[PDB]
Amino acid sequence: RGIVRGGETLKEHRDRLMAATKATGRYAGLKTLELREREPILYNKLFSRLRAGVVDARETAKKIAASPIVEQEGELCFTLYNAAGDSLLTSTGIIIHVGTMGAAIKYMIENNWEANPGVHDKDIFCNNDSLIGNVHPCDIHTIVPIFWEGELIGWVGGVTHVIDTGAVGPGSMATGQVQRFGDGYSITCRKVGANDTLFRDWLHESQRMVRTTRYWMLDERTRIAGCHMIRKLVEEVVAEEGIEAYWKFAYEAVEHGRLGLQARIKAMTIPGTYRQVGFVDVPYAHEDVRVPSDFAKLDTIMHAPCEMTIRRDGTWRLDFEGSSRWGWHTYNAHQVSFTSGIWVMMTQTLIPSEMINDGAAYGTEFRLPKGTWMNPDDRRVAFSYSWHFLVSAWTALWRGLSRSYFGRGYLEEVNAGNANTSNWLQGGGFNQYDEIHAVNSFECAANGTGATAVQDGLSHAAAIWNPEGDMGDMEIWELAEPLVYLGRQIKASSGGSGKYRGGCGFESLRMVWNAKDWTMFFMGNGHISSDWGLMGGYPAASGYRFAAHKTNLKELIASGAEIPLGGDTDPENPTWDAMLPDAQIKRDKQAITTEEMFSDYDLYLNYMRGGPGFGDPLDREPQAVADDINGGYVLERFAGEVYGVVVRKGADGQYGVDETATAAARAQIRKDRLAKSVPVSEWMKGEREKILAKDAGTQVRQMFAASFKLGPRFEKDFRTFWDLPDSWTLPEEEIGVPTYGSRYSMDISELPDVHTVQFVEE
C-alpha cells in the first residue's frame, strides 16, 4: 500500500497529477474548482487560517536565532505543500525557496525515498544540495511530512540562510574554491531525526563541519519550531473542518494561482515578442584572486539573453538560447533556482494580490539549454555565490514587462529593474569572544531600486530576493562581527541617471577591532553594471574596492589627528587617503577577492549598489536635481554634464536652480548630441571590421565562443546581423586561455540510481 491518502505511492500520485496537467492545461486536471465555487465561505476560512499560520511561524520562530541575518533581517521562510510537493501557501521573506524545497520533495518522490529510507510520521529531513535545485549551501532546508490517520496528506518546509557552511572561503558568498570540492557541507535529503528527535551522529558531524557552530545550532532549532507549529495548525484545521474540505483545498489553491497569473497577464500586459539581455564580470585573472587550480585563472563574462513571448491566450514563454557556459568559480546555478527566481520577480509585479504558490510556475514556459550556467551539465560545479549570475540575468526581465505596462498606460507598475545585490562583506578567524568565527553582512539586503515611469526609485531599500529590505542596526552587527562603524552614509551618484533617477545605494566604513588571526575579502560586480536604464535612463554605478592596512590609526586617534569617517563621497577625489600617509591602500576596480590578512585598526569599505534610471535625464525636473545635490544623492559636478541643470549656492549654503542658464544648457546639449553621434550604419561598419579582425579582449571573445557552441540559433543571429562570411570562425581554443570543461562534462544523472526531475525545456 502506498503512503498517500487513498493508497497511491508518492510517485503514483504525482505522476497522475502531472499527466492530467499536461493533457488538460489545468493543474491536476481541475476544470472546475468545487470547493471554491460551491463553498466560498469555507474556501476563504481555510485560506485565512493557513496563511495566518505560515506568516505567524516566520514571525515567531525567528526569535530563536542568535544570528541577526535570521532574527532581525528575517532571511527565513516557511511553506505548506500538498502530497505531490506543490506549494499551497507561504510566509513572505526568502520565497525563492518555495520552489527549491518543493523540488527537493519531488526528488524524494522520484527516487523512491518511500521504500528506503522510508517516509514516516514524525521524521525530520534536512537538505541543501544545489545539484537537485537549491540556490547555495548556506540556505538550509528542514522538511517534515504531515500525516492524518496514518496517511500522508502534505509536507512543511522551513529555510534559514546560515552564516557559513565550512567552504574554503570564510563567509556565505564565498570565494577560494572553484568546484563542489571545498564549496561547503552539502546534505542530500538526509533523514536527520525520527520521533521528533534529532539524531546525535548528525548533531556531532554537522556542528564540526562549520565555523559558526552556535549560530548554526540556533538556526536549526528555528527551522524545526516553525515546521512543528505549522504541522500542529494543519492537524487542528483538519479536525475542525474535516479532511475532505482540506484535501480539496490542497489542489484547488494551486490551480487558482495559475488562473490568477493568466488573468493578470491579460489585464496588464500586451501580446508580442520582447528581447533583452544582461551581463556581469568574473575578473579571476587578477593576482588577488588566489584560487588553487590553474585552469580557473582567467577573466570571463556571464551572458544571459532572453526572448520573452506573451501569447493571446495569456500564457507566456522565456527562452535563454544564447547564454554562456558554467565555469570554474562559485556563480553557477540550476534550472530550479533560476526559474524560481523569475517566479519571485512575478510576485513583486504581476501577482502580488493573487495566490502566492506554485500555480504561477505551471502558467509559465521556460527553455534553458543544457550546459549553460543556468542549467549545467557537470556534477563538479560550485554554487556558494549563485546570486552573482542570477540577479544579473533577472534584472532584464523587468525591462521587458515594463514595456508592456508602459504601452498600455499602467505607468505605476513600470520598474527599470533590480540592483546588483552586493558588496558582501566577508571574513573569518577569532572574534571578540575568542571563538572561531565568520562574518557575512546583510547590509546588501538594502540596495537601490529601479526608477518608475512616474517617480524616482527608492534608495537603500530592497533586494530582488526579498523586497522587505532591512540594513540592520549598527549596534546589532557589532555583536556579531569584530568590527566597528566609522561611517554609514547614502552613496552619492550611485543611482542610475534619468528623468526619474534610480535609487542610490549606501556605504559603511569599518575598522577592525578586537579580532585575532583575522582575514577579509570582497564579492560583487566590478567592471560591469548588470542593470540597464529604461527608455533613455542609465545603469546604476558599478563596483570598486577600498581597503587600508598598517594605517597607524592607534597613534592618529591618540594624537588628535584627522581620522577617516563617513563615506567615500567622491572616489575620484577622495579625502581619506591623504589622512593615512603610512598605510598600504588598495583602491581599484577589483570587486572580487579571496581572503587576505587584516589586523586591528585596518579599514574596509562596504559599498551597496544603486538601481537603474528611467527616461532622458534632460527631461528631469530641474528642482529635483538641486534637491538631490542638497540631499547627498548626486555630486554637484554631474548636474551640468548629465542633466543640463545649472545650480548655484545661495547665502544659506543650499543649491538652487538658475532657470535661464538651465534652458540654454539643455538647448546646447541637444546640439552636442547631434555633433558627437553618427548614423548607426556608420558605427556598425567600424564595429564589423573589429569583429572580422578578432579585435577585443580575451574575456569578450571567450563569452561569444562559448555562447555560440551552446546556442546555434544565437550564432546564426550574430552572423546575419554583422553580415559575416562563413570563412570567419571563433573557436574557443584559439583564444589562448584555459578551456577545461568546454567539451567534456558528466551530469549528476549519470551516477547510479539517480533520477533527476525535469522542470524546463532544455
719 binds, among a copy of itself, Mn ion, Mg ion, none (CB under 5 to 8 A by kind): none
Q: Angle at the Cα of 49 (from 48 to 50), degrees rounded to 5?
A: 95
Return the range that interacts with Mn ion (CB under 5 A); candidates 136-144, 151-159, 451-459, 645-653.
Answer: 136-144
Is residue 727 a contact residue for a copy of itself (CB under 8 A)? no
Is 204 a residue that touches a copy of itself (CB under 8 A)? yes
Ramachandran area for residue 576 (φ above 0: left; ψ -120 to 50: alpha; else beta): alpha
Site mask, a copy of itself, residues 50-89, x = CB under 8 A? ----------------------------------------
Closest approach of a copy of itself to the CB of residue 126, in Å: 10
Stretch near Mn ion under the rule CB under 5 A, chosen from 135-143, 195-203, 500-508, 711-719 = 135-143
- For the bound state, the minimum distance from the C-beta of residue 127 to a copy of itself, rounded and expressed in Å, comes to 9
Per partner kind, with CB cut-offs from 5 to 8 A, the member of a copy of itself, Mn ion, Mg ion, none near residue 749 is Mg ion
Residue nearer to Mn ion on the CB measure, 78 or 614: 78
Is residue 449 within 8 Å of 415, Cβ to Cβ?
yes
Residues 663-722 that bind Mg ion (CB under 5 A): 675
Least Å distance, CB 298 to Mg ion, is 21
Is 36 an interacting residue with respect to a copy of itself (CB under 8 A)? no
Long-range Cβ contact pairs of 579-582 (< 8 A, separation 24 or more) = 580/548, 580/551, 580/552, 580/553, 580/556, 582/550, 582/551, 582/552
Q: Which residues of 126-156 are buried (b: 16+ CB within 10 A; e: fewer)?
A: bbbbbbbbbbbbbbbbbbbbbbbeebbbbbb
Q: Is 754 in the site for Mg ion (CB under 5 A)?
A: yes
Residues 640, 662: Cα–Cα separation, whole Å = 8
Nearer residue to Mg ion within complex by CB, 264 or 325: 325
SS3 for 582-616 is CCEEEEECCCCCCCEEECCCCEEEEECCCCCCECC
- 415 to 454: interface string for a copy of itself, x by CB under 8 A: --------------xx---xxx------------------
Structural contact between residues 20 and 13, judged by C-beta atoms closer than 8 angstroms = no
Residue 423 and residue 608: Cα distance in Å, rounded? Answer: 6
Residue 380 Cβ vs Mn ion, minimum distance, rounded to whole Å:
21
User: 139 has which bridge partners?
Assistant: 161
C-beta closer to Mn ion: residue 247 or 343: 343
User: Is 139 among the residues that bind Mn ion (CB under 5 A)?
Assistant: yes
Least Cβ distance, residue 459 to a copy of itself (angstroms):
36
Residues 211-230 vs a copy of itself: string with x where CB under 8 A?
A: x-x---x-------------
Q: How many residues line the site for a copy of itself (CB under 8 A)?
A: 68
The reply on whether position 187 binds a copy of itself by CB under 8 A is: yes
- 3-class DSSP state for residue 262? helix
Distances 157 to 114, 213, 353, 501, 659 between C-alpha atoms, Å: 18, 22, 23, 39, 59
The CB-of-168 to a copy of itself minimum distance in angstroms stands at 5
DSSP labels for 391-425?
A: HHHHHHHHHHHHHHHHHHT-GGG----BPP-----
Write the DSSP assignment of 19-78 as a string of letters: HHHHHHSSGGG-SS-HHHHH-HHHHHHHHHHHHHHHHHHHHHHGGG-SSHHHHTT--EEE
Find which of a copy of itself, Mn ion, Mg ion, none residue 139 binds, CB within 5 to 8 Å per kind: Mn ion
Q: Which helix (H) or strand (E) holds 206?
A: helix 200-208
Site for a copy of itself in 559-598 (CB under 8 A): 594-597
Q: Which residue's CB is nearer to Mg ion, number 120 or number 755?
A: 755
* CA–CA separation, 58 and 90 (whole Å): 10
CB of 147 to Mn ion, least distance (A): 30
Which residue, chain included where needed, has cell 557559513?
A: 164
Site residues (CB under 5 A) for Mn ion?
138-139, 161
Site residues (CB under 8 A) for a copy of itself?
111-113, 116-117, 129, 131, 166-169, 176-177, 179-182, 186-191, 197, 199-205, 207-209, 211, 213, 217, 290-295, 379-380, 429-430, 434-436, 516-517, 519, 594-597, 738, 740-741, 743-744, 746, 748, 751-754
